[PDB]
Amino acid sequence: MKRTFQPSVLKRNRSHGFRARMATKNGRQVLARRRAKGRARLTVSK
Amino acid sequence: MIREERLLKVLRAPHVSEKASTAMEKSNTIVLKVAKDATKAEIKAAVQKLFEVEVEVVNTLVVKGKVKRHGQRIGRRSDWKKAYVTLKEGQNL
Amino acid sequence: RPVYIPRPRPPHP
Amino acid sequence: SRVCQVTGKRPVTGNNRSHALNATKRRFLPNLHSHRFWVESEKRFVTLRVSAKGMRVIDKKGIDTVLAELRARGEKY
Amino acid sequence: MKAKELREKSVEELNTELLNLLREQFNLRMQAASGQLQQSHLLKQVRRDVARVKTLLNEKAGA
Amino acid sequence: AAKIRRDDEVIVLTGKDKGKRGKVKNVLSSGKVIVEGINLVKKHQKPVPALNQPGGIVEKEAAIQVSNVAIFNAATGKADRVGFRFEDGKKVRFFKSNSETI
RNA sequence: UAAGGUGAUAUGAACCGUUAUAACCGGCGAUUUCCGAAUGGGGAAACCCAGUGUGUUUCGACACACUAUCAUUAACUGAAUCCAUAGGUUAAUGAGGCGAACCGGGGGAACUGAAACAUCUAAGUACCCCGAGGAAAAGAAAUCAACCGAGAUUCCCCCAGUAGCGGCGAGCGAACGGGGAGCAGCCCAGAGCCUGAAUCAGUGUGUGUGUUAGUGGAAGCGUCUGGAAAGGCGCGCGAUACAGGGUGACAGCCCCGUACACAAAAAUGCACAUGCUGUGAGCUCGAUGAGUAGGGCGGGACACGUGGUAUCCUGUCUGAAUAUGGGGGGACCAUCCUCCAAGGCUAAAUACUCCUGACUGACCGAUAGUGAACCAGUACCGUGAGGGAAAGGCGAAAAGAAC
RNA sequence: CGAAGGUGUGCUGUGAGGCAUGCUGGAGGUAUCAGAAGUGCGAAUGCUGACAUAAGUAACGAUAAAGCGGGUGAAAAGCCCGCUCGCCGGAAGACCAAGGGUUCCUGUCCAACGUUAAUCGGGGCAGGGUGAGUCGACCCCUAAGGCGAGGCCGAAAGGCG
C-alpha cells in the first residue's frame, strides 16, 4: 500500500523551502506570519 | 598578511585513542584536531612551522557531533575536523 | 540539532 | 495600464442597473488610443496613449506645453 | 597591564601580539588538551591580553 | 554600602542562639553571612573514592540572614546600628547612641 | 560604586581583588563570523563560484577594497540618415526591507435581516492592495443664514429617532441653531520704489530644566509562650519617613526602602539669549487660475433608493461669461441677500500603543488568568498554509538521611 | 496554650443552614450593618482529569522447528560457545540510489522500552569510529521547465516574455 507521503529532500526544499517562500509576496506573508507567532522553524530547513 | 597568526589558530588539539596510537607507531602519522575550515594547505603549513617537522600529505575528515539526552533535555555536540598528517622518515613528536 | 548536509556518497557498484 | 498620459483618466468601477434595479459591478474604461504627435521643437514624432478628451486638450493647448507638463510629472513619454 | 603598552610604537605592538599568540596561547592550548596543564586560569588571562593589544592596534592604525 | 563586612565581630539578635557573639567569615549575595560556632549543622557527608574521604558527620557552619546579626559596639556591651558619614572625602561607618567611628 | 568577585541550571577545579585599573552599574568608543532587502553572479537560506584594483614568506599562494537594480543630476561616448536623437560607460545623491494599532486613497463580499425573496439591509463592514506620519486627513467660503446676522478646519454634548428617505416594508437618518475643547492665518499666477525689513529652516556658543550611574536618610529594650518571635505583658523613642518588600509566627524603631536634602567627566530632548548661512519685510499700480463652470447620456456620494430632486464627483460626447462677470440660497422663474470655483501651504483641540518607567484594581489565583507562572509557541500532529498541549508548591535553613 | 481546609460526634431552626467540640492541619480568618456578583449543578450522546466494569477474559502479529551439553549469572527455553535438526537460496544472500541520521564498534547497567523472562538488544550511560588528484558531489554544458535587465500588458497586487 503506497502511502501519500513519499519523502524527497529536493522536492521538499524546492516546494516549501525558504527561497521558495521569498519568491512570491504570498510566501513572504507566510514567513511574516510565522515570525509574528514566534515559531522556531520558519520553514522546512534541510 | 595574517598568515602567521592564522597558522597559530588552525591547530586546536591532538587526538588520543587506540586508532591514533596504532597509526603513529605503524604509519608514522599524527592525528590532531583542527578548526572547522582548516584547509589542507593551512594544516600542512602549520605543522611544518609550529612543530618544526617535515610532512608528506594531510588527510582531513569532519566528525558530526553526537546527539545526547542530558537530564530532561536533548542536546547536540559541535562538529569538529580531525586531520591525519603523515610525517616523513624523520619524526619528532 | 538539524543536520543540513545530505551529500551523496555512491560506492562504485 | 489603461491610463491616459495627458489627463490621467483611468478606469473607474461602477454599477449597471436593470429595470428591476438589480446592481452588478461594472467598469468604465477611458476612450484611449495610440496616436503619434509631430513636435516641431524636437522635429520628430512622439507616440502617446491618450484619450479622446486628452487629444482635444492637446489641440486646445500646445503639444509643447503638454509635453512640458508630462516631463514635470516625472514619467517618461 | 592596560596603559603600560599604550605608549609603545606599532612595531612593538605587533611583536608582542605575535608572541602572545605564539607562546602562552598555542602552547597553553596543547598543554590543556594533553592534560598537563593544572593552572587553567592562564588560558582566559592570555586571551584577554590578546584582545587588549588588538584594541590598541585599531585605535592606533588608521583612525 | 554594606553595614556588615568581611572582618567584623557581631552578635545574634534572633535565631536558635540569640545573644551569641562571633565573627563573620563571608557574606553571600543573598544577604546571608557565616559565623563561627553559631549555627552548626551535622551534615551527613557521603564517602567518595576521590582524593578526599571525609566520611562520618561533619559539623559545618550554616549561613544566617544578615538582618539577624548586628555589629557589636564592644564598648557599651550591646548590639548597635551602623550609619555612614563622609570624613575627609571617604565614607566610613559609625555606631549610634554616642556614635563613634569604627 | 566597591570588599568582594569569575551569569544561571550547578556544585567543583584553577584564580583575581580588599583603598583602589577585582567585580558590578552608566555615557562615549572598538570588535561585530555566516544567512536574511542581501546588494559581485548563482542557489535547495545560513552554501557554491568569480572579475577588477591595491600590498606581500618557495612561481607556489596569501590580505584588504570594490563590483546589484531602479530614479534624478553631470561628464564622456554614440546608431539606422548630415546634424540630432535613441542607446552605452563612468561619478555623485536618494530609494529598496521590516513593524501591533491608529490615518488617507484604489478595489470590495456573503452570511444575515426583511419571519420567503429580487429593490433594500448587512455595508462601504470583513478582506486584498498602495502611500505617509507621529499623528494623518481636512482647513482659510464661488460657506451658512435670513433679509437680523456669524465668519478656517477638526473633536465632544444637544438639537434628535425630530425633518426626511424607504417593496413608505424591514430599516436608514440629517441640517439649521445652541453649549464646550482649541484658535492662525498666508503664498504664487508681476512689475516698480525701498532692499536682511519681521517671521522661518540648517549649523556654533551660553543659562535653566529633564533623561542615561548614584549618595545620605530618623528612632527598642526586658520578661512569658514557643523550633524560631515581628506575638502577649511592661515601660520608651522617631515621624515633612507606619507607602511597600524581606527577615525562623503579625516589625514605624533588624535589613532594603520610604518622606526629605543632594549628585554628572561624557552624550542627550525641551524653553530662551547671542552669531553665520539660505528664501524672504513695507508701499503704489495691475493681475486674479478654460476644455474649466454648465449641459446631454451612464453611474456613484450626500439621511435623501430618480422621485417634483437641489448640491458634489466622475466614464463618454459637448461647452460659456470672465467681473458693466459668475456661483449659491433644495424643481423652476423674477426680486433681494451672501460669496468669488476651475493653484497651493498651515501647529491646536482628535485616533491608537509593538515598546519604556512609575502607580492603581469590590480583576484572576494554576481546569482560573495570556495558548504559555515550570528554558511554550515548546513537545506533538500535518506535504504544506496551519493547529497546538500537559506540567507550580519539601524545609526557616539541605541541615537532601554518615553508619 | 493552634486560623482556613479536611474528618467525626453532639445540640439547634417549618427550610436552605447555624452553633460547640475530638483528631489531622499548619497560618491565616472575620462579627454586626450595608455594597457589588464569574453567587449555588445530577443530567446538556456537556468539557478536563482520576478511577471502575467486562477480566485476570480475548490476544501475545504468518503453522520455517527445534533438541541437548557446557559457560556466564542472584536467576537461562530465548544471551555466548559446541554438536545435531529445520527454513530461504532470481533470496529470507551480497550491493547501492532515494529516505533515515549514529541505529555502526567497544565497555558497562536492566528502571522504562522489547506484546513473556532477559545476564541479551536497533534500550540507558560513557568512550571510540567516516582519511580520495582518479568514487560521487562541487564544477563546464544543456532538456522539460523556472526566473527574467530593458520591453509589452494590466485598477493596485501583478501577467507574459
PDB file of C-alpha atoms (C1' of nucleotides) in Angstrom, chain G residues 99-326:
ATOM      1  C1'   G G  99       6.946  46.792  12.103  1.00  0.00           C
ATOM      2  C1'   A G 100       0.670  45.931  16.890  1.00  0.00           C
ATOM      3  C1'   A G 101      -2.887  49.652  16.176  1.00  0.00           C
ATOM      4  C1'   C G 102      -4.469  54.447  14.511  1.00  0.00           C
ATOM      5  C1'   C G 103      -4.787  57.792   9.123  1.00  0.00           C
ATOM      6  C1'   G G 104      -5.796  58.725   3.562  1.00  0.00           C
ATOM      7  C1'   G G 105      -6.607  56.518  -1.071  1.00  0.00           C
ATOM      8  C1'   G G 106      -7.538  52.243  -5.040  1.00  0.00           C
ATOM      9  C1'   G G 107     -10.815  47.600  -5.081  1.00  0.00           C
ATOM     10  C1'   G G 108     -14.836  45.155  -2.419  1.00  0.00           C
ATOM     11  C1'   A G 109     -18.124  40.434  -0.495  1.00  0.00           C
ATOM     12  C1'   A G 110     -21.502  36.921   1.519  1.00  0.00           C
ATOM     13  C1'   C G 111     -23.856  35.099   5.540  1.00  0.00           C
ATOM     14  C1'   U G 112     -27.796  37.614   7.918  1.00  0.00           C
ATOM     15  C1'   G G 113     -32.397  40.947   8.469  1.00  0.00           C
ATOM     16  C1'   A G 114     -36.962  41.706   5.764  1.00  0.00           C
ATOM     17  C1'   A G 115     -40.048  35.844   9.761  1.00  0.00           C
ATOM     18  C1'   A G 116     -39.841  33.582   1.801  1.00  0.00           C
ATOM     19  C1'   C G 117     -37.222  36.785  -1.781  1.00  0.00           C
ATOM     20  C1'   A G 118     -35.098  40.080  -6.300  1.00  0.00           C
ATOM     21  C1'   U G 119     -35.266  46.757  -4.651  1.00  0.00           C
ATOM     22  C1'   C G 120     -33.286  47.483   0.223  1.00  0.00           C
ATOM     23  C1'   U G 121     -30.466  45.794   4.575  1.00  0.00           C
ATOM     24  C1'   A G 122     -25.938  43.615   6.323  1.00  0.00           C
ATOM     25  C1'   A G 123     -22.029  47.624   4.431  1.00  0.00           C
ATOM     26  C1'   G G 124     -18.512  50.815   2.196  1.00  0.00           C
ATOM     27  C1'   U G 125     -18.300  46.120   7.068  1.00  0.00           C
ATOM     28  C1'   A G 126     -14.679  41.756   6.560  1.00  0.00           C
ATOM     29  C1'   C G 127     -10.686  41.087   3.384  1.00  0.00           C
ATOM     30  C1'   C G 128      -6.799  42.321  -0.547  1.00  0.00           C
ATOM     31  C1'   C G 129      -3.514  46.431  -2.475  1.00  0.00           C
ATOM     32  C1'   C G 130      -0.855  51.337  -2.371  1.00  0.00           C
ATOM     33  C1'   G G 131       1.425  55.725   0.470  1.00  0.00           C
ATOM     34  C1'   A G 132       2.997  58.681   4.667  1.00  0.00           C
ATOM     35  C1'   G G 133       3.211  60.396   9.562  1.00  0.00           C
ATOM     36  C1'   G G 134       3.886  60.731  14.914  1.00  0.00           C
ATOM     37  C1'   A G 135      -0.313  61.640  14.305  1.00  0.00           C
ATOM     38  C1'   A G 136      -2.912  61.546   9.469  1.00  0.00           C
ATOM     39  C1'   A G 137      -6.788  63.780   6.847  1.00  0.00           C
ATOM     40  C1'   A G 138      -9.388  68.332   6.451  1.00  0.00           C
ATOM     41  C1'   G G 139      -8.711  73.573   6.539  1.00  0.00           C
ATOM     42  C1'   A G 140      -8.996  79.778   5.413  1.00  0.00           C
ATOM     43  C1'   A G 141     -16.110  80.317   1.856  1.00  0.00           C
ATOM     44  C1'   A G 142     -17.609  80.639  -5.577  1.00  0.00           C
ATOM     45  C1'   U G 143     -19.988  78.661   3.163  1.00  0.00           C
ATOM     46  C1'   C G 144     -24.406  79.403   6.040  1.00  0.00           C
ATOM     47  C1'   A G 145     -28.314  82.388   7.362  1.00  0.00           C
ATOM     48  C1'   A G 146     -32.174  85.251   6.823  1.00  0.00           C
ATOM     49  C1'   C G 147     -33.188  89.605   4.552  1.00  0.00           C
ATOM     50  C1'   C G 148     -31.446  90.107  11.630  1.00  0.00           C
ATOM     51  C1'   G G 149     -26.631  88.296  11.453  1.00  0.00           C
ATOM     52  C1'   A G 150     -21.931  84.596  12.266  1.00  0.00           C
ATOM     53  C1'   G G 151     -17.218  84.466   9.885  1.00  0.00           C
ATOM     54  C1'   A G 152     -10.969  78.346   8.556  1.00  0.00           C
ATOM     55  C1'   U G 153     -10.825  73.074   9.742  1.00  0.00           C
ATOM     56  C1'   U G 154     -11.287  69.252  13.494  1.00  0.00           C
ATOM     57  C1'   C G 155     -13.393  66.789  18.078  1.00  0.00           C
ATOM     58  C1'   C G 156     -17.306  66.160  22.343  1.00  0.00           C
ATOM     59  C1'   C G 157     -22.668  67.190  24.437  1.00  0.00           C
ATOM     60  C1'   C G 158     -27.548  68.945  22.496  1.00  0.00           C
ATOM     61  C1'   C G 159     -30.916  69.722  18.585  1.00  0.00           C
ATOM     62  C1'   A G 160     -32.999  64.325  17.559  1.00  0.00           C
ATOM     63  C1'   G G 161     -35.130  58.644  16.440  1.00  0.00           C
ATOM     64  C1'   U G 162     -37.069  65.139  15.112  1.00  0.00           C
ATOM     65  C1'   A G 163     -37.392  66.830   9.448  1.00  0.00           C
ATOM     66  C1'   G G 164     -36.977  63.499   5.668  1.00  0.00           C
ATOM     67  C1'   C G 165     -35.591  58.751   2.763  1.00  0.00           C
ATOM     68  C1'   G G 166     -37.922  53.812   2.338  1.00  0.00           C
ATOM     69  C1'   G G 167     -41.053  46.764  -1.879  1.00  0.00           C
ATOM     70  C1'   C G 168     -43.173  54.374   2.614  1.00  0.00           C
ATOM     71  C1'   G G 169     -41.775  47.338   4.288  1.00  0.00           C
ATOM     72  C1'   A G 170     -37.525  45.813   7.282  1.00  0.00           C
ATOM     73  C1'   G G 171     -34.678  49.616   8.227  1.00  0.00           C
ATOM     74  C1'   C G 172     -31.645  54.211   7.288  1.00  0.00           C
ATOM     75  C1'   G G 173     -31.478  59.093   9.455  1.00  0.00           C
ATOM     76  C1'   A G 174     -29.791  64.789   8.875  1.00  0.00           C
ATOM     77  C1'   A G 175     -29.267  70.020   8.840  1.00  0.00           C
ATOM     78  C1'   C G 176     -30.148  74.950  10.718  1.00  0.00           C
ATOM     79  C1'   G G 177     -29.248  76.534  15.547  1.00  0.00           C
ATOM     80  C1'   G G 178     -27.103  76.352  20.684  1.00  0.00           C
ATOM     81  C1'   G G 179     -23.253  74.949  24.668  1.00  0.00           C
ATOM     82  C1'   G G 180     -17.855  73.455  25.040  1.00  0.00           C
ATOM     83  C1'   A G 181     -12.256  71.929  23.825  1.00  0.00           C
ATOM     84  C1'   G G 182      -8.804  74.653  20.860  1.00  0.00           C
ATOM     85  C1'   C G 183      -7.902  79.035  17.831  1.00  0.00           C
ATOM     86  C1'   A G 184      -3.664  81.341  12.901  1.00  0.00           C
ATOM     87  C1'   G G 185      -3.596  82.814   9.238  1.00  0.00           C
ATOM     88  C1'   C G 186      -0.885  83.043   4.488  1.00  0.00           C
ATOM     89  C1'   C G 187       1.709  82.396  -0.565  1.00  0.00           C
ATOM     90  C1'   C G 188       2.152  82.060  -6.308  1.00  0.00           C
ATOM     91  C1'   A G 189      -0.041  83.103 -11.093  1.00  0.00           C
ATOM     92  C1'   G G 190       4.197  90.581 -11.536  1.00  0.00           C
ATOM     93  C1'   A G 191       6.392  94.986 -12.356  1.00  0.00           C
ATOM     94  C1'   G G 192       8.348  99.432  -9.739  1.00  0.00           C
ATOM     95  C1'   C G 193      10.301 102.216  -5.124  1.00  0.00           C
ATOM     96  C1'   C G 194      12.595 100.824  -0.811  1.00  0.00           C
ATOM     97  C1'   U G 195      16.219  96.070  -0.136  1.00  0.00           C
ATOM     98  C1'   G G 196      18.322  91.442   5.881  1.00  0.00           C
ATOM     99  C1'   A G 197      12.915  94.581   6.637  1.00  0.00           C
ATOM    100  C1'   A G 198       9.824  90.841  10.652  1.00  0.00           C
ATOM    101  C1'   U G 199       8.899  85.584  10.551  1.00  0.00           C
ATOM    102  C1'   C G 200      11.076  80.649   9.271  1.00  0.00           C
ATOM    103  C1'   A G 201      14.874  76.147   8.221  1.00  0.00           C
ATOM    104  C1'   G G 202      20.040  74.443   8.894  1.00  0.00           C
ATOM    105  C1'   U G 203      24.821  74.795  11.700  1.00  0.00           C
ATOM    106  C1'   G G 204      28.166  77.228  16.810  1.00  0.00           C
ATOM    107  C1'   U G 205      28.205  79.474  21.809  1.00  0.00           C
ATOM    108  C1'   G G 206      25.783  80.405  26.935  1.00  0.00           C
ATOM    109  C1'   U G 207      21.667  79.882  31.025  1.00  0.00           C
ATOM    110  C1'   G G 208      17.649  76.780  33.056  1.00  0.00           C
ATOM    111  C1'   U G 209      15.186  72.181  33.245  1.00  0.00           C
ATOM    112  C1'   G G 210      14.760  66.747  32.302  1.00  0.00           C
ATOM    113  C1'   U G 211      16.681  61.617  30.857  1.00  0.00           C
ATOM    114  C1'   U G 212      21.032  57.963  30.972  1.00  0.00           C
ATOM    115  C1'   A G 213      25.225  55.709  37.006  1.00  0.00           C
ATOM    116  C1'   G G 214      24.096  57.263  42.241  1.00  0.00           C
ATOM    117  C1'   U G 215      24.840  59.402  47.801  1.00  0.00           C
ATOM    118  C1'   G G 216      22.914  60.436  52.969  1.00  0.00           C
ATOM    119  C1'   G G 217      18.315  59.077  55.124  1.00  0.00           C
ATOM    120  C1'   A G 218      15.448  59.192  61.910  1.00  0.00           C
ATOM    121  C1'   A G 219      14.114  56.071  66.106  1.00  0.00           C
ATOM    122  C1'   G G 220      13.653  49.323  71.360  1.00  0.00           C
ATOM    123  C1'   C G 221      14.721  47.157  75.065  1.00  0.00           C
ATOM    124  C1'   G G 222      13.245  43.413  79.451  1.00  0.00           C
ATOM    125  C1'   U G 223      10.267  39.137  80.731  1.00  0.00           C
ATOM    126  C1'   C G 224       6.113  34.945  79.010  1.00  0.00           C
ATOM    127  C1'   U G 225       4.735  31.191  75.245  1.00  0.00           C
ATOM    128  C1'   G G 226       7.418  28.769  71.753  1.00  0.00           C
ATOM    129  C1'   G G 227      11.628  25.002  66.886  1.00  0.00           C
ATOM    130  C1'   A G 228      12.108  30.158  65.968  1.00  0.00           C
ATOM    131  C1'   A G 229       9.063  35.869  67.563  1.00  0.00           C
ATOM    132  C1'   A G 230       7.972  40.677  64.350  1.00  0.00           C
ATOM    133  C1'   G G 231       3.061  37.801  69.145  1.00  0.00           C
ATOM    134  C1'   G G 232       1.098  38.579  74.669  1.00  0.00           C
ATOM    135  C1'   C G 233       2.655  41.591  79.023  1.00  0.00           C
ATOM    136  C1'   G G 234       5.612  46.303  80.926  1.00  0.00           C
ATOM    137  C1'   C G 235       7.971  50.644  80.132  1.00  0.00           C
ATOM    138  C1'   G G 236      10.402  54.055  75.952  1.00  0.00           C
ATOM    139  C1'   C G 237      11.732  56.970  71.257  1.00  0.00           C
ATOM    140  C1'   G G 238      11.353  58.705  65.760  1.00  0.00           C
ATOM    141  C1'   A G 239       7.748  60.580  62.254  1.00  0.00           C
ATOM    142  C1'   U G 240       7.895  66.630  56.107  1.00  0.00           C
ATOM    143  C1'   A G 241       9.612  58.865  56.885  1.00  0.00           C
ATOM    144  C1'   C G 242       3.559  53.325  59.814  1.00  0.00           C
ATOM    145  C1'   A G 243       3.865  53.551  51.122  1.00  0.00           C
ATOM    146  C1'   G G 244       5.815  48.594  50.274  1.00  0.00           C
ATOM    147  C1'   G G 245       9.208  44.129  50.328  1.00  0.00           C
ATOM    148  C1'   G G 246      12.353  40.747  53.252  1.00  0.00           C
ATOM    149  C1'   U G 247      13.863  38.684  57.835  1.00  0.00           C
ATOM    150  C1'   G G 248      12.622  31.058  61.697  1.00  0.00           C
ATOM    151  C1'   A G 249       4.606  33.294  63.558  1.00  0.00           C
ATOM    152  C1'   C G 250       1.814  39.599  62.728  1.00  0.00           C
ATOM    153  C1'   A G 251       8.231  44.905  62.743  1.00  0.00           C
ATOM    154  C1'   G G 252       7.233  52.811  62.350  1.00  0.00           C
ATOM    155  C1'   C G 253      12.256  51.862  65.791  1.00  0.00           C
ATOM    156  C1'   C G 254      16.681  44.305  62.463  1.00  0.00           C
ATOM    157  C1'   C G 255      17.633  44.932  56.895  1.00  0.00           C
ATOM    158  C1'   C G 256      16.375  47.046  51.791  1.00  0.00           C
ATOM    159  C1'   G G 257      13.472  51.067  51.244  1.00  0.00           C
ATOM    160  C1'   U G 258      10.078  55.413  52.136  1.00  0.00           C
ATOM    161  C1'   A G 259       9.307  61.470  53.091  1.00  0.00           C
ATOM    162  C1'   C G 260      13.202  64.822  52.645  1.00  0.00           C
ATOM    163  C1'   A G 261      18.024  67.142  51.035  1.00  0.00           C
ATOM    164  C1'   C G 262      21.903  66.438  47.375  1.00  0.00           C
ATOM    165  C1'   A G 263      24.714  64.366  42.816  1.00  0.00           C
ATOM    166  C1'   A G 264      27.173  64.338  36.252  1.00  0.00           C
ATOM    167  C1'   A G 265      33.673  63.708  33.463  1.00  0.00           C
ATOM    168  C1'   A G 266      30.600  62.370  28.778  1.00  0.00           C
ATOM    169  C1'   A G 267      26.123  62.036  25.494  1.00  0.00           C
ATOM    170  C1'   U G 268      21.306  63.923  25.027  1.00  0.00           C
ATOM    171  C1'   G G 269      15.314  66.276  24.344  1.00  0.00           C
ATOM    172  C1'   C G 270      12.853  70.833  25.736  1.00  0.00           C
ATOM    173  C1'   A G 271      12.292  76.725  26.613  1.00  0.00           C
ATOM    174  C1'   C G 272      15.294  81.170  25.972  1.00  0.00           C
ATOM    175  C1'   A G 273      19.550  84.979  24.569  1.00  0.00           C
ATOM    176  C1'   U G 274      23.525  85.680  21.305  1.00  0.00           C
ATOM    177  C1'   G G 275      26.482  84.643  15.779  1.00  0.00           C
ATOM    178  C1'   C G 276      26.668  82.539  10.491  1.00  0.00           C
ATOM    179  C1'   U G 277      24.130  80.536   6.105  1.00  0.00           C
ATOM    180  C1'   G G 278      19.511  80.421   2.606  1.00  0.00           C
ATOM    181  C1'   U G 279      14.451  82.119   0.979  1.00  0.00           C
ATOM    182  C1'   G G 280      12.463  86.408   2.469  1.00  0.00           C
ATOM    183  C1'   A G 281       9.752  92.944   5.127  1.00  0.00           C
ATOM    184  C1'   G G 282       6.762  97.666   3.780  1.00  0.00           C
ATOM    185  C1'   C G 283       4.070 100.989  -0.092  1.00  0.00           C
ATOM    186  C1'   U G 284       1.754 102.124  -5.426  1.00  0.00           C
ATOM    187  C1'   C G 285      -0.356 100.010  -9.749  1.00  0.00           C
ATOM    188  C1'   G G 286      -2.014  95.800 -12.260  1.00  0.00           C
ATOM    189  C1'   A G 287      -3.408  90.814 -12.425  1.00  0.00           C
ATOM    190  C1'   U G 288      -6.663  87.426 -10.010  1.00  0.00           C
ATOM    191  C1'   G G 289      -6.419  80.025 -12.116  1.00  0.00           C
ATOM    192  C1'   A G 290     -10.752  77.174 -19.946  1.00  0.00           C
ATOM    193  C1'   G G 291     -11.754  72.298 -22.100  1.00  0.00           C
ATOM    194  C1'   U G 292     -12.857  74.590 -16.895  1.00  0.00           C
ATOM    195  C1'   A G 293     -18.317  76.101 -14.949  1.00  0.00           C
ATOM    196  C1'   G G 294     -22.769  74.411 -17.247  1.00  0.00           C
ATOM    197  C1'   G G 295     -25.303  70.836 -20.492  1.00  0.00           C
ATOM    198  C1'   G G 296     -26.826  65.517 -22.982  1.00  0.00           C
ATOM    199  C1'   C G 297     -26.083  60.023 -21.819  1.00  0.00           C
ATOM    200  C1'   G G 298     -24.492  56.099 -17.869  1.00  0.00           C
ATOM    201  C1'   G G 299     -23.226  55.541 -12.767  1.00  0.00           C
ATOM    202  C1'   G G 300     -21.585  56.891  -7.683  1.00  0.00           C
ATOM    203  C1'   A G 301     -21.628  60.177  -2.963  1.00  0.00           C
ATOM    204  C1'   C G 302     -24.619  63.449   0.021  1.00  0.00           C
ATOM    205  C1'   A G 303     -30.055  60.849   5.666  1.00  0.00           C
ATOM    206  C1'   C G 304     -32.189  61.803   0.528  1.00  0.00           C
ATOM    207  C1'   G G 305     -33.379  54.213  -3.423  1.00  0.00           C
ATOM    208  C1'   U G 306     -34.922  59.334  -9.730  1.00  0.00           C
ATOM    209  C1'   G G 307     -38.768  60.744  -7.266  1.00  0.00           C
ATOM    210  C1'   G G 308     -41.306  67.339  -8.297  1.00  0.00           C
ATOM    211  C1'   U G 309     -34.858  66.481  -6.612  1.00  0.00           C
ATOM    212  C1'   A G 310     -31.314  70.964  -5.334  1.00  0.00           C
ATOM    213  C1'   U G 311     -25.736  70.243  -4.290  1.00  0.00           C
ATOM    214  C1'   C G 312     -20.884  67.432  -5.200  1.00  0.00           C
ATOM    215  C1'   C G 313     -17.749  63.574  -8.057  1.00  0.00           C
ATOM    216  C1'   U G 314     -16.909  61.093 -12.267  1.00  0.00           C
ATOM    217  C1'   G G 315     -16.643  57.159 -17.783  1.00  0.00           C
ATOM    218  C1'   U G 316     -18.479  59.278 -22.656  1.00  0.00           C
ATOM    219  C1'   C G 317     -19.956  63.499 -26.189  1.00  0.00           C
ATOM    220  C1'   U G 318     -20.178  68.784 -25.976  1.00  0.00           C
ATOM    221  C1'   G G 319     -19.032  73.553 -23.964  1.00  0.00           C
ATOM    222  C1'   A G 320     -19.510  79.651 -21.915  1.00  0.00           C
ATOM    223  C1'   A G 321     -19.084  84.642 -19.425  1.00  0.00           C
ATOM    224  C1'   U G 322     -14.686  86.294 -17.163  1.00  0.00           C
ATOM    225  C1'   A G 323     -16.196  90.881 -13.294  1.00  0.00           C
ATOM    226  C1'   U G 324     -20.781  96.580 -16.689  1.00  0.00           C
ATOM    227  C1'   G G 325     -18.948  88.914 -14.866  1.00  0.00           C
ATOM    228  C1'   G G 326     -20.013  84.415 -12.376  1.00  0.00           C
TER     229        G G 326
END
